[PDB]
Ligand binder design. Structure first.
Ligand SMILES: c1ccc2[nH]ncc2c1
Length: 168
């Protein structure tokens, strides 16, 4: 149904809300939720852990089966697997982990994966355990994504700082 509500329109195609992505997925029934994935699709932490827990581990079971046959993703890459109870599809996107020395330039590649989907519910890529500057990630999103992206930011402080930064 893609019933997004209460987002702040930043650009013609980028929207943001102070919200929990799992609660958004349940409320909105999106066609596509983006996972903040790693290359092995091991969803024990970060947003991936929240989405996997909300699927009662179905996402992890499917991901384990996928990797054993298909091999890992690349940093800046993606795959489309089931959305389980959260969405029709899950776009697993690997942003660079700058806490582990990966090239922040790959954040552009990471966001280019969104352009294959008309509308997405997504987290800010390379935030949290991936260590990237969230203000920078929002700028790469705005400059790279052409399709409609609805960003959910959990932390009110960080949301407020992102909106302030973007309106400068
Ligand atoms: C086949 C199955 C799993 C794999 N992982 N990496 C390469 C590869 C090939």
């Amino acid at each position: 149904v893609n019933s997004f509500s209460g987002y702040l329109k930043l650009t013609d195609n980028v929207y943001i809300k102070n919200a929990d992505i799992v609660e958004e997925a349940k409320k909105v029934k999106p066609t596509v939720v983006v996972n903040a994935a790693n290359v092995y699709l091991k969803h024990g932490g970060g947003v991936a852990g929240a989405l996997n827990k909300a699927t009662n581990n179905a996402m992890q079971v499917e991901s384990d089966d996928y990797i054993a046959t298909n091999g890992p993703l690349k940093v800046g890459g993606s795959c489309v697997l089931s959305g389980h109870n959260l969405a029709k599809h899950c776009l697993h996107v690997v942003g660079p982990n700058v806490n582990k020395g990966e090239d922040i330039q790959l954040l552009k590649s990471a966001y280019e994966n969104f352009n294959q989907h008309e509308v997405l519910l997504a987290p800010l890529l390379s935030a949290g355990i991936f260590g990237a500057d969230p203000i920078h990630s929002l700028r790469v999103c705005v400059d790279t994504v052409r399709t409609n992206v609805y960003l959910a930011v959990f932390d009110k402080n960080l949301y407020d700082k992102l909106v302030s930064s973007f309106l400068e």
